[PDB]
Amino acid sequence: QENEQRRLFIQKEEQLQQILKRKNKQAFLDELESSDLPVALLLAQHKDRSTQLEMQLEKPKPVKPVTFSTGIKMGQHISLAPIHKLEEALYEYQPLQIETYGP
Amino acid sequence: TVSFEVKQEMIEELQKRCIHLEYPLLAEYDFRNDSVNPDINIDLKPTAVLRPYQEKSLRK
Amino acid sequence: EKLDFLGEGQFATVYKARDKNTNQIVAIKKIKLGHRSEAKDGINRTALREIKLLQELSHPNIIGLLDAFGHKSNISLVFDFMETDLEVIIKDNSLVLTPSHIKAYMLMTLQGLEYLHQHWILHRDLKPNNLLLDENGVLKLADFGLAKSFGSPNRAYTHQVVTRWYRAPELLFGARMYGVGVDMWAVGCILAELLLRVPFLPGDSDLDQLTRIFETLGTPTEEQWPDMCSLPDYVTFKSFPGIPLHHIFSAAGDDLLDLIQGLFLFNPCARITATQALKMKYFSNRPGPTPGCQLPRPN
Amino acid sequence: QTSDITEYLRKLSKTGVPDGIMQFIKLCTVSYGKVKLVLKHNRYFVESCHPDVIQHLLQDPVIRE
């Protein structure tokens, strides 16, 4: 349960980094669409809102490991191959039980 | 700082001539991540710096 | 209308929710499937003949059926509710004891398999828990998630199926052909579990299960089960003799040994079926079975 | 930026602007460059200033992404 909360917290932090990355794209798209010199103060305050957002994120985290997971967490690809299950169980002392096979 | 991405890598020579054609000047900075060989990126060197005529030119 | 939650399963989660119109309690078994993908199979027809053909066939030893609905993703099953099963009698809970009540279990189990074999239907999903019990004590089956309509010839089909604890000797080697002995193998295995109240065949995969079965029953020789070396997928083991069956089980009469030996036969062509098993000397004696009222129920 | 150093020059003259010819010129070359990082090519980010990015969209982004 502790490792499950750590892996789930990585997706929560990864989503905030993607929104912060996409926020700079929206500022560059509208940087010259409606700006003819007087509109230049908003870009200076853009990094100020991005710096304070990173300061409020680096503190409430116990330094998560660098992983490459999906922040949205959807139907991830496994192998889609007839891999069956374990490596033929392979006994050693007392046998247990293995789940049955399904289509 | 608003970071961008890479445009097919090959597109690069045409950008160096369009910026200087107008009026702004470019200045490619430091840092890299390709072609490594000397172990890592900190090698071996004593931190005891000397010669003030080189340290002042280094920080500049 | 969700009511209460029970447990999980192999590929379907059991839900105790009261359905509409019909006032009977329905145990919905939702099968986890897909719908997000484009060219996705979605629903599997391995249970299509279960929720469409069971309404026509009526039998007391066979589970019932009301309706059926779904849409690829969530396929909610509509089946009658059952009290307890059989695994709770042996596993964990050891307080519930059945003194000479096992005769009523095999009597109502062979009648259910005989009715399915008459309509050319095999229950290729035998495991020590499908024998569901209701309030009246009527022994009924669980689900038909691996049923198939067979005929006179026997061709190649699926392999490495069925619970690994109860596996036929011809199915572990990967034989292409099979027959009635597939469903008649676990009949004696369930009977062997209710006697000593312990797992009779505690094996692992297909390789470990061959060791436990052969060291207790024996190795099929040429006089016993012919046609063995012709199969490609074959392994050579030790010359296992054969442990008798009248000394392993303590509470076992003389008439009980006449049925256990015929069920554990390694020859599918010579293995006893359901009609010849009900006409033996075990189901025609003085200790008559109980109808179901005197049968105890778990807590 | 050149607009910051201009205010320091006006205070040094003590009530007096530096003519006015070089005041309108303080709008040509800016601070721009490229940085090589994990992208294995170029990552476009320079300085925390803002006038160094506004006057650039009408040249390179207009002809190629």
From Swiss-Prot, chain A:
Keywords, A to Z, come to: Acetylation, Cell cycle, Metal-binding, Nucleus, Phosphoprotein, Transcription, Transcription regulation, Zinc, Zinc-finger
Q: Which terms does the record give in the GO molecular function aspect?
A: cyclin-dependent protein serine/threonine kinase activator activity; zinc ion binding
The subcellular location is:
Nucleus
**Tissue-wise expression:** Highest levels in colon and testis. Moderate levels are present thymus, prostate, ovary, and small intestine. The lowest levels are found in spleen and leukocytes.
Q: What broad class describes the main subcellular location of this protein?
A: nucleus
- List, in alphabetical order, the GO biological process terms annotated in this UniProt record: adult heart development; DNA repair; G1/S transition of mitotic cell cycle; negative regulation of apoptotic process; nucleotide-excision repair; positive regulation of smooth muscle cell proliferation; regulation of G1/S transition of mitotic cell cycle; regulation of transcription by RNA polymerase II
Which GO cellular component terms are attached? CAK-ERCC2 complex; cyclin-dependent protein kinase holoenzyme complex; nucleoplasm; transcription factor TFIIH core complex; transcription factor TFIIH holo complex; transcription factor TFIIK complex
**Its quaternary structure?**
Associates primarily with CDK7 and cyclin H to form the CAK complex. CAK can further associate with the core-TFIIH to form the TFIIH basal transcription factor.
Q: What does this protein do?
A: Stabilizes the cyclin H-CDK7 complex to form a functional CDK-activating kinase (CAK) enzymatic complex. CAK activates the cyclin-associated kinases CDK1, CDK2, CDK4 and CDK6 by threonine phosphorylation. CAK complexed to the core-TFIIH basal transcription factor activates RNA polymerase II by serine phosphorylation of the repetitive C-terminal domain (CTD) of its large subunit (POLR2A), allowing its escape from the promoter and elongation of the transcripts. Involved in cell cycle control and in RNA transcription by RNA polymerase II.
Could you tell me what this protein is called?
CDK-activating kinase assembly factor MAT1
Swiss-Prot record, chain C:
Q: Which SUPFAM superfamilies match?
A: Protein kinase-like (PK-like) (SSF56112)
Expression is induced as follows: Repressed by DNA-bound peptides.
Q: How is its activity regulated?
A: Inactivated by phosphorylation. Repressed by roscovitine (seliciclib, CYC202), R547 (Ro-4584820) and SNS-032 (BMS-387032). The association of p53/TP53 to the CAK complex in response to DNA damage reduces kinase activity toward CDK2 and RNA polymerase II repetitive C-terminal domain (CTD), thus stopping cell cycle progression. The inactivation by roscovitine promotes caspase-mediated apoptosis in leukemic cells. Specifically inactivated by THZ1.
Indicate yes or no for the key word Cell wall biogenesis/degradation. Answer: no
Sites bearing Phosphoserine, chain numbering: 152
Q: How does it assemble?
A: Associates primarily with cyclin-H (CCNH) and MAT1 to form the CAK complex. CAK can further associate with the core-TFIIH to form the TFIIH basal transcription factor; this complex is sensitive to UV light. The CAK complex binds to p53/TP53 in response to DNA damage. Interacts with CDK2, SF1/NR5A1, PUF60 and PRKCI. Interacts with HINT1.
**The protein, known as:** Cyclin-dependent kinase 7
Q: Which organism is it from?
A: Homo sapiens
Gene encoding this polypeptide? Answer: CDK7
Curated annotation (Swiss-Prot), chain D:
Q: How is it modified after translation?
A: Dephosphorylation reactivates the 5'-excision step. Phosphorylation has no effect on transcription or the 3'-5' helicase activity.
- What subcellular compartments does it reside in? Nucleus
Q: Which domain of life is it from?
A: Eukaryota
Record's function text: ATP-dependent 3'-5' DNA helicase/translocase. Binds dsDNA rather than ssDNA, unzipping it in a translocase rather than classical helicase activity. Component of the general transcription and DNA repair factor IIH (TFIIH) core complex. When complexed to CDK-activating kinase (CAK), involved in RNA transcription by RNA polymerase II. The ATPase activity of XPB/ERCC3, but not its helicase activity, is required for DNA opening; it may wrap around the damaged DNA wedging it open, causing localized melting that allows XPD/ERCC2 helicase to anchor.
What other remark does the UniProt record contain for this protein?
A: The TFIIH core complex from patient XP11BE (a patient with XP/CS who has a C-terminal splice-site frameshift from residue 741 in this protein) reconstitutes in vitro transcription about 30% less well than wild-type but does not restore NER in vitro or in vivo. The XP11BE TFIIH complex has all the subunits in the same stoichiometry as wild-type. Purified mutant protein has very weak 3'-5' helicase and ATPase activities. In another paper the mutant protein has wild-type 3'-5' helicase activity. The mutation is recessive to wild-type. Conventional DNA helicases unwind DNA by binding to a ssDNA overhang of dsDNA and then translocating on this strand with cycles of ATP binding and hydrolysis to 'unzip' the dsDNA. XPB/ERCC3 is believed to be an unconventional DNA helicase principally because it translocates in a 3'-5' direction along dsDNA instead of ssDNA, thus it is referred to as a DNA translocase.
**What gene is this protein a product of?**
ERCC3
What stretch of the whole protein does this chain cover?
132 to 196 of 782
